[PDB]
């Protein structure tokens, strides 16, 4: 019972974006939406964007989006390591265990986590300051279009559940710590951790969503689906670095990506 709240509390501090806020905003002005290249350039120009993007100058709309995407990943991955630390008994794990879980984990956790800002119409950007059309993301020249859509497809089915922030935190913690990941020093401590974290979900679902008694099976399924998406994501990212002269990968992202697929 203590474990569950501790994850919720840890999750709340670490992540700027939570489900309530994304849903709520969607309040003097609505988040500026980008449905077009023209709109993107103007959105790109504005003071907030300039402040928070690292001042990217690439000259390719598709290239800038892919680089702009990266700020979110680095930002999320950094937050994920902190979340992992908060989880009881994660601190214990050996550096090979902690790092290995994170490298596989960070992208799986994000995709489930990404959903809350996501909408069938669009996804929130710049801490909710901006909205980008799903159509517009899909329009971008290959292979840049491919990355956003399946994540959205997963997002549509995943959103439907539907999970409070407490639910996610438990889900996320489970994703982060997996016995299966390659090269783990100890299988038993992670597996023991998973059981604890996963058990909490079971107790949690019964009080929280009495209306759905089957949530855990469906929720568990998502991890298998998520695993494929990271594989699919990884393969795509690899394409860009080889195919495109222009695209650039953050040092942290390279370490995570390398050896993952």
């Amino acid at each position: 019972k203590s474990l569950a709240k501790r994850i919720y509390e840890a999750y709340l501090k670490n992540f700027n974006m939570n489900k309530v806020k994304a849903r709520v905003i969607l309040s003097n002005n609505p988040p500026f939406v980008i449905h077009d290249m023209e709109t993107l350039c103007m959105a790109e120009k504005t003071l907030v964007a300039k402040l928070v993007a690292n001042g990217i100058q690439n000259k390719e709309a598709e290239v800038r989006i892919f680089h702009c995407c990266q700020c979110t990943s680095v930002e999320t991955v950094t937050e994920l390591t902190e979340f992992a630390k908060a989880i009881p008994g994660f601190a214990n794990l050996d550096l090979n265990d902690q790092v290995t879980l994170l490298k596989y984990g960070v992208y799986e956790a994000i995709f489930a986590m990404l959903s809350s800002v996501m909408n069938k119409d669009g996804m929130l950007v710049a801490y909710g300051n901006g909205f980008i059309t799903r159509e517009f993301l899909k329009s971008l020249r290959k292979p840049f279009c491919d990355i956003m859509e399946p994540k959205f497809d997963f997002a549509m089915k995943f959103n439907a559940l539907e999970l409070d922030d407490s639910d996610i935190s438990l889900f996320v913690a489970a994703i982060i710590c997996c016995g299966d990941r390659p090269g783990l020093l100890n299988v038993g401590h992670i597996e023991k951790m998973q059981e604890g974290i996963v058990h909490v979900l079971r107790l949690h679902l019964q009080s929280n969503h009495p209306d759905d008694i089957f949530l855990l099976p469906k929720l568990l399924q998502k991890m298998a689906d998520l695993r494929q998406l990271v594989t699919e994501h990884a393969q795509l990212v690899q394409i860009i670095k080889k195919t495109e002269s222009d695209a650039a990968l953050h040092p942290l992202l390279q370490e995570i990506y390398r050896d993952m697929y």
Binding site: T81, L252, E255, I256
Partner: peptide, 11 residues
């Protein structure tokens, strides 16, 4: 092999 990640945890 994972400089950034080791640094992140240790700080």
């Amino acid at each position: 092999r994972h400089k950034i990640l080791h640094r992140l945890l240790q700080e």
